[PDB]
UniProtKB/TrEMBL annotation, chains A, B:
Protein name: Phospho-beta-glucosidase
Enzyme class name: hydrolase
EC identifiers of the protein: 3.2.1.86
Biological process terms in GO annotation: carbohydrate catabolic process
InterPro entries: GH, GH_1_N_CS, Glyco_hydro_1, Glyco_hydro_1_AS
Binding site for beta-D-glucose 6-phosphate: Q19, H131, N176, E177, E376, A432, G433, K439, Y441
GO MF: 6-phospho-beta-glucosidase activity
Length: 478, 478
């Protein structure tokens, strides 16, 4: 009499240090790229400023003060019955500037305290090494991951973490959503993935590919080093999975979708297979893109392939071939996509396609034959607190439950290997794309708004007990 | 000044023994499954009879008498400048019944003669071991490839061929279009792939999966013995690649297409990766399909993976989720497919989709990262001989040229590894599905009709000199 998922399935929740910790200067922590991004809103991009300026609002400085509240917050995770908790180690807490000879003890101690607290309640940490929060010093001084020197800085950081937590953290990922930067047209991904600040005349695409290359090399070096430190460590990649569907069976739409997926997921090919697909080299040739790519890089990549694929899933896309002057079937994320008329969308226009998660799980399995870990899934929405003092987020329950149903079908009917599932922003935190508190994801409401006002009190939403019962039934009761 | 295709590109043409040789009783040849299939036409199935019956017309018995005319025909291939020539070794010429302890010398000598003739002109043989022509005795005595005993019979046959031709044939494939039988609803594929004759009450699908399993094991064992005889032999699989497009971006259509591709191409996963995808095991478990599948089989499959993927391409398909009562997203090739509203079609209703060949080349490359060989592509059409004594088959030139253009883009722009290209039915022969002469594919016209009359004289069509120029220009001039 067993359920459809394995008994040890890793139910949990996921966050990122810069989005919830606050304490942005505590323990000698350095300024991160998140610390120079102002608040925005749907339709209004966050301002990336040259340092911390007066007259600007930086929501990540204080966030929800998890740095101080974590013991109480972790109690809440335990009440829901989390089996794991995904977060990031703030690079700037360990290497404030990035190029220090020795790591920061106060930073390392904080994660000792945090991971110890999780383990007290039987909650396994899942750690992302780089999650959109590299030291700003690496940006101004070195040019971020456009600089081969930054590879060694990351590997140093990774090695320190692997060694410190080798007996406390079983699950690791190197670069959060490493493929986001493929959208090089907008500033968000390049600045966050990679510490790239563009100037007039820059070939944004060529520079993106160079930084992505250095990150893939850094990831591979880190994987090898982590396994040397402890061969039992599970070390994965992390890609944002937004399946791109052809609009119709017109062969042109079909090829557009195939070629768009190729360009957005070559990162996974490198992480998994250890070499670049040939279509990337051909593309670079047509665009006259030159990438500093050495024989040592080739060896590192081949020897540092990942144990599993971590991924985020929120939505799917649709592409067609309506665009003129596209003889090479290039993909422009900002131009070739169209709306899917068969699905609904969030208030931030993120398409709701739970069946796409089943598609995604099958796609990764068929392509790569590795274990998968859904390390983000969530529904960002405006919450209202009712007269009973609780947010009745039936909309969030509906979204999450629909996705859980599809992932269960992938395991039970399709045979995919799925390690676990960690809803994003399980406690309300500062959003990434827009920097809002109002775009809420949590099972736990936090009393703080986009003007920085509120008590910061935590309270369960309707979805809190719902998810508690999901975990307790191992997914049988949704 | 190099061409877009590599210099060593294997331009050629492809046929199958039973479709052109005739001489069906010569040299002690046994009755094959082809020898018990009567002629049909479009919309009229060939009759599969119990032995050779009086009053029935069997077009494969004489075909175009290539058994006697091969020296003159090979000379025409040489005039077109073929780099290679693909055909099959008739299983029934080597093992007339299938279960003989020793091979037939007259059969082996014929292929020595044929391959020698090719090599006199620098034409490299490409050999398919099983191409819809297994010994009919294996059907009646053992139940064809539904019987584990037939594995050893095939491997014996393969070993004999590898040894005899180890220094004459560089390129081999095991089972022609092994995946056709994914369509188990009609009699054709199960009979021709596997020697399956169904009776009332049979679980057609379960029986197919069993025969497919024994063939995949046989293929793996054949690869192993071939490489043991001569490790330089290139031994590939052969799948029919009909890409299955979703009709629309409806997530249900998307999932139907993904699952249909899984069911139609798991054969390739086994040939390439050396293990069955888990979605097959889950499907069998759900459907209560039991397969005789041993640990020795598992080891053989893992050890006997192929060097390259040979495939045929003629058309693409479209699927949708219209069929009711299909909650598990099963694939029925005869019910779930729909017409592509964006394409034209041949007079036998075969959809014309040259871009789908580019999709196909990318799909195999992304999934398997092996060299590919397009070993069939062609346009079957009615030909008229004009007053100048020549068929002006501009329609055939148009189809082949359109496909060549797409394959060149796959190599030049997408970086696929493509070994060569061999148009199907390069000399007019007896068709497979309908057993017609009138459904012509050739660069070379053969004067024989569907009543079996005519001189059997060979004459070039307009496409003959066209293809001669394609090869001479290595595809620069189409
Ligand atoms: O916060 P958003 O903009 O709504 O996006 C949700 C999350 O999904 C991913 O993009 C990131 O890994 C997270 O950092 C981000 O918060
Ligand atoms: O002869 P048909 O029915 O038109 O199909 C063309 C060819 O395509 C493939 O299905 C077979 O491998 C060949 O044997 C066959 O002849």
């Amino acid at each position: 009499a067993m359920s459809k998922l394995p008994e040890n399935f890793l139910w949990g929740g996921a966050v990122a240090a810069h989005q919830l910790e606050g304490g942005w200067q505590e323990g000698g922590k350095g300024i991160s790229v998140a610390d120079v991004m102002t608040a925005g809103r749907h339709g209004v991009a966050r301002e990336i400023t040259a340092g911390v300026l007066e007259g600007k609002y930086y929501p990540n400085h204080e966030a929800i003060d998890f740095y101080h509240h974590y013991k109480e917050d972790v109690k809440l995770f335990a009440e829901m019955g989390f089996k794991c908790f995904r977060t990031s180690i703030a690079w700037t807490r360990i290497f404030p500037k990035g190029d220090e000879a020795e790591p920061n003890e106060a930073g390392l101690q904080f994660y000792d305290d945090l991971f110890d607290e999780c383990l007290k309640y039987g909650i396994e940490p899942v750690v992302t090494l780089s999650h959109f929060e590299l030291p700003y010093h690496l940006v101004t001084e070195y040019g971020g991951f456009t600089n081969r020197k930054v590879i060694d800085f990351f590997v140093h950081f990774a090695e320190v973490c692997f060694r410190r937590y080798k007996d406390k953290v079983k699950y690791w990922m190197t670069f959060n959503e490493i493929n986001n930067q493929a959208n090089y047209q907008e500033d968000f991904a390049p600045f966050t993935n990679s510490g790239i600040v563009y100037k007039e005349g820059d070939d944004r695409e060529a520079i993106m590919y160079q930084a992505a290359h250095y990150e893939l090399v850094a990831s591979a070096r880190a994987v090898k080093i982590g396994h040397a430190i402890n061969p039992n460590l599970n070390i994965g990649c992390m890609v944002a999975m937004c399946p791109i569907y052809p609009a119709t069976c017109n062969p042109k739409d079909i090829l557009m979708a195939q070629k768009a997926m190729q360009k957005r997921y070559y990162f996974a090919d490198v992480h998994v297979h250890g070499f670049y697909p040939e279509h990337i080299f051909k593309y670079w040739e047509r665009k006259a893109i030159k990438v500093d790519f050495t024989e040592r890089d080739k060896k590192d990549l081949f020897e540092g392939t990942v144990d599993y694929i971590g991924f985020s899933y929120y939505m799917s896309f649709v592409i067609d071939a309506h665009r003129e002057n596209n003889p090479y079937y290039d993909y422009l994320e900002t131009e070739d996509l169209v709306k899917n008329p068969y699905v609904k969308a969030s208030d931030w226009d993120w398409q709701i396609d739970p069946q796409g998660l089943r598609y995604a799980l099958n796609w990764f399995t068929d392509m790569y034959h590795l274990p998968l870990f859904i390390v983000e899934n969530g529904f960002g929405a405006i919450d209202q607190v009712e007269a009973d003092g609780m947010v009745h987020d039936d909309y969030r329950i509906d979204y999450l439950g629909a996705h859980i149903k599809e992932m269960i079908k992938a395991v039970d009917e399709d045979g995919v290997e799925l390690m676990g599932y960690t809803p994003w922003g399980c406690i309300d935190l500062v959003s990434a794309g827009t920097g809002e508190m109002r775009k809420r994801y949590g099972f736990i409401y936090v009393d703080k708004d986009d003007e920085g006002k509120g008590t910061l009190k935590r309270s369960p939403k309707l979805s809190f007990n719902w998810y508690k019962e999901v975990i307790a039934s191992n997914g049988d009761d949704i």
